[PDB]
Ligand binder design. Structure first.
Ligand SMILES: [Cl-]
Ligand SMILES: [Cl-]
Ligand SMILES: [Cl-]
Ligand SMILES: [Mg+2]
Ligand SMILES: [Mg+2]
Ligand SMILES: [Mg+2]
Ligand SMILES: [Mg+2]
Ligand SMILES: [Mg+2]
Ligand SMILES: [Mg+2]
Ligand SMILES: [Mg+2]
Ligand SMILES: [Mg+2]
Ligand SMILES: [Mg+2]
Ligand SMILES: [Mg+2]
Ligand SMILES: [Mg+2]
Ligand SMILES: [Mg+2]
Ligand SMILES: [Mg+2]
Ligand SMILES: [Mg+2]
Ligand SMILES: [Mg+2]
Ligand SMILES: [Mg+2]
Ligand SMILES: [Mg+2]
Ligand SMILES: [Mg+2]
Ligand SMILES: [Mg+2]
Ligand SMILES: [Mg+2]
Ligand SMILES: [Mg+2]
Ligand SMILES: [Mg+2]
Ligand SMILES: [Mg+2]
Ligand SMILES: [Mg+2]
Lengths: 77, 147, 70, 97, 50
RNA sequence: AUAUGGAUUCUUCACGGUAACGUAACUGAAUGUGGAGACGUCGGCGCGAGCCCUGGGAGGAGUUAUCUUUUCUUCUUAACAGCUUAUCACCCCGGAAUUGGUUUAUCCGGAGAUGGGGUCUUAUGGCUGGAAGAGGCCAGCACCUUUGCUGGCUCCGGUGCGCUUGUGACGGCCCGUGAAAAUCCACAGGAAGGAAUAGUUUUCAUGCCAGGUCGUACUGAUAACCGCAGCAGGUCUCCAAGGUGAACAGCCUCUAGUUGAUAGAAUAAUGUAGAUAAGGGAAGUCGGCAAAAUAGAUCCGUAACUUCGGGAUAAGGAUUGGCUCUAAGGGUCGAUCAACUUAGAACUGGUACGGACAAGGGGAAUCUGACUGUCUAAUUAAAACAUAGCAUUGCGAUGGUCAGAAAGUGAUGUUGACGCAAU
RNA sequence: UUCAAAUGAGAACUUUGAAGACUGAAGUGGGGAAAGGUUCCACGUCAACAGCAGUUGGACGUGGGUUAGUCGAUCCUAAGA
């Protein structure tokens, strides 16, 4: 229900002591004037709100996954 | 048998009315054994129950008739049942024309072709039914500027 | 009612007409040593009250139903 | 830009009741370009190899038009009861027996 | 109607339970003269009038 | 219930903007003031939503003797959240007759217009999150089976005196000016409480707990209600597709729903209901009762009388199809794009054309009530009642008219002679 | 209204399929207020009831079914009591 755009803020939410679950969604969509690319959405389940971070760079996306805390339960697709 | 309840369940499951549900007349025994909605879904999957197509309501003649009207046909005195006001209100015609005239006067004044003093005179003449269309106003402006 | 036990993890009871949801939740915990997520109740057309008691995920309604005797 | 449409006729041809050459000739004299037929002035080109019929056009052409012409060809030869025009993926079609 | 007070619903509940045939085994008791329920009610014939 | 983060304080209770005012926050008791709740009806105009119509493309289905790049169908996006979006209104600069601006509708300006630059309400719309993982449409595989598995696509536009509905700014009308309260907020006020080795803010953010009781099925009517009944009666309301046409008219169709009302055979008289008639045309009859004639639209033409508003569609005439063309009436920026409106001309036919449906007979006078309105539910709708207008009567409150067994009792009266009451 | 099949001791009237039609969006469509009170749903079943018929039913017999912090009541006041 809420979207965040700052990656530094995203990491703070993942260790907020009330977050237990998260999911990663992959979307195959097209860009403005080119061939389709890969879009990934990182969703953090808070107590009262769901936070969504969307990044359209696949190279920058893989680094975010490796940086997620291990204690967080992550759901794939 | 009595398949009244099977047809009702099939219509709800498929999502159409009971008039669009077809039950296989050669599969009465297996249809009678389908009491749940899960069993109805299986019968739809294997073709025992099918959804009939909608009855066609073509608009081919409507489209062809509309094309004839766009060419000026079927518009004589023998085809009119309402009054001229009922077909097209005279107030609607007036509002279109006055908005056309006022839109042109503002365009010319902004473009610098007409000063505000001549604009004000022509503003109240158009309101006074002086000009019958846009062409009459443009010609009047040319004559005023030519003198 | 039995379909709600193994599928919905919900126990169905007939309760007294004078009992509210607070008392129903307390009675189930004391009698059966389980945790109650929520209670839904209705008054049946025959004049008796029926309660839908859903247990938490930490308990299985089917195991509790077998222990009771049904 | 140009668009390419391919029709797979392998299955009907293997039986022997279908002729890709005759079907390819039907599309030459029945495609209308900006009006009537016979206006394939370097706009519509159809090529066959015995198993796949490939149509390349730069004018107004669509999959619905290709299926409409194919169904007319199948009905003319009385093949509708056995052969069906099916779209496998985008702009790639095949005939099912 | 769907909107009904508790008193009306409780009244309707009792009338439903009283509308049943007499058990068969009762007619076999010693000195029994009761054959059929003389207070049977049908919703379309006789109205409750509450 | 409470903690952390943020904000604030050594100038103790925040800063920016000329201003309209802006913000993540940014002490406020008694008491007081203000706002919201909170409001008629009709008319046109602007805008939004759903629906309707329609172009390209990706799928499925129908038709195919012949014709039809064709006919039908799927292509969807909730509450909520972030950013953004406005007619009206307001602020700053400036100082107007050669008066300007401006609405379909004539209103505004030295009590500051036009113009340039700003601020604000968020009805409403746009993008994103919710959210494709859902739903929808197809294709390829397994198979008594608990029944699934794997794939694709779900896209981009146009149009308006359209329909329904919401809403905004205005205008018309009244001897009619079209509820109340619970409840929530703001302001004025300054009682108190508060900092330096420390505190306050739960009107900023995040986190924790709980939310009882009763109703909830179904019919909603030519079979579930009331009329003695499964009675052609009676019974409040929301949603509303295409064509014809002025139209929620009549007539035909799509979605959805029904195909129910004892049947079969025959076709006498008399009926009930629907119709047609040669010549005459009210001679019928208490009486033109009933029926017939007239009928839409466009153009022409229209008397006596009159309270000058009417009479009036007075009366009385002409025209109307189909087809092929022509002229005029627009938007955005020479070019390019898009609406049905009206007028006219050839050609064509068994002279037909509001071709079904739909749809005024008219005129000259007398009696009577001015008009619209109202009543004898179940035999009388009228000339009867009412009405505006006119006149008369009573009364200045310790009062007039009227109520009550009584009353430390009431109606007019939340009233005061331009009033109330009685004819 | 018609043809065929299925069921049954028995079919103009039940079920399914096919055909012909109607309501024609101010409906014979889709929801409700009042009123009714289990008529709702499944299984079993036809003596009586459905002014013919009946294997069908709003009939007869036995069971099943109405889940709310957010929809209403509850709270407020209106004429009035
Ligand atoms: Cl009920
Ligand atoms: Cl006769
Ligand atoms: Cl008079
Ligand atoms: Mg006008
Ligand atoms: Mg006018
Ligand atoms: Mg409840
Ligand atoms: Mg019964
Ligand atoms: Mg319900
Ligand atoms: Mg009754
Ligand atoms: Mg009754
Ligand atoms: Mg009675
Ligand atoms: Mg005659
Ligand atoms: Mg004659
Ligand atoms: Mg005579
Ligand atoms: Mg005589
Ligand atoms: Mg008559
Ligand atoms: Mg009168
Ligand atoms: Mg009138
Ligand atoms: Mg009478
Ligand atoms: Mg009468
Ligand atoms: Mg009188
Ligand atoms: Mg009083
Ligand atoms: Mg009809
Ligand atoms: Mg019809
Ligand atoms: Mg039933
Ligand atoms: Mg009978
Ligand atoms: Mg019988």
């Amino acid at each position: 229900a809420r979207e965040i755009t700052d990656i530094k803020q995203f990491l703070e939410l993942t260790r907020r002591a009330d977050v237990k679950t998260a999911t990663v969604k992959i979307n195959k969509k097209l860009n403005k004037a080119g061939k389709p690319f890969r879009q990934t959405k990182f969703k953090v389940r808070g107590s009262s709100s769901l936070y969504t971070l969307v990044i359209n760079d696949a190279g920058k996306a893989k680094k975010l996954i490796q940086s997620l805390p291990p204690t967080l339960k992550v759901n794939r697709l | 048998a009595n398949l009244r309840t099977q047809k009702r369940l099939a219509a709800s499951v498929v999502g159409v009315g009971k008039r669009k549900v077809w039950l296989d007349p050669n599969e009465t025994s297996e249809i009678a054994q389908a009491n749940s909605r899960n069993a109805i879904r299986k019968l739809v999957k294997n073709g025992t129950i099918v959804k009939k197509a909608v009855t066609v309501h073509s608009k081919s003649r409507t489209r062809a008739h509309a094309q004839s009207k766009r060419e000026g046909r079927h518009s004589g005195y023998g085809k009119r049942k309402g009054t001229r006001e009922a077909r097209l209100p005279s107030q609607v015609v007036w509002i279109r024309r006055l908005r056309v005239l006022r839109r042109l006067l503002a365009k010319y004044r902004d473009a610098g072709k007409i000063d505000k003093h001549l604009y004000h005179v022509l503003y109240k003449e158009s309101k006074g039914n002086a000009f019958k269309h846009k062409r009459a106003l443009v010609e009047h402006i040319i004559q005023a500027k030519a003198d | 009612a039995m379909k709600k036990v193994e599928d919905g993890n919900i126990l169905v009871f007939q309760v007294s007409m004078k009992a509210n949801k607070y008392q129903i939740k307390k009675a189930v915990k004391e009698l059966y040593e389980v945790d109650v997520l929520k209670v839904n109740t209705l008054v049946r057309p025959n004049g008796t009250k029926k309660a839908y008691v859903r247990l938490t995920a930490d308990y299985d309604a089917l195991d509790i139903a077998n222990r009771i005797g049904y | 830009i140009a668009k390419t449409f391919t029709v797979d006729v392998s299955s009907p041809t293997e039986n022997g009741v279908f002729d890709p050459a005759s079907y390819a000739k039907y599309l030459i004299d029945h495609i209308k370009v900006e009006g009537a037929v016979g206006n394939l002035g370097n706009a519509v080109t159809v090529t066959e190899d015995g198993t796949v019929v490939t149509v390349v056009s730069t004018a107004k052409f669509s999959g619905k038009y290709l299926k409409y012409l194919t169904k007319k060809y199948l009905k003319k030869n009385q093949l509708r009861d056995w052969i069906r025009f099916v779209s496998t993926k985008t702009n790639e079609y095949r005939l099912a027996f | 109607s769907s909107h009904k007070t508790f008193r009306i619903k409780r009244f309707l509940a009792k009338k439903q339970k009283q509308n049943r045939p007499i058990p068969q085994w009762i007619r076999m008791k010693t000195g029994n003269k009761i054959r059929y329920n003389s207070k049977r009610r049908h919703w379309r014939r006789t109205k409750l009038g509450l």
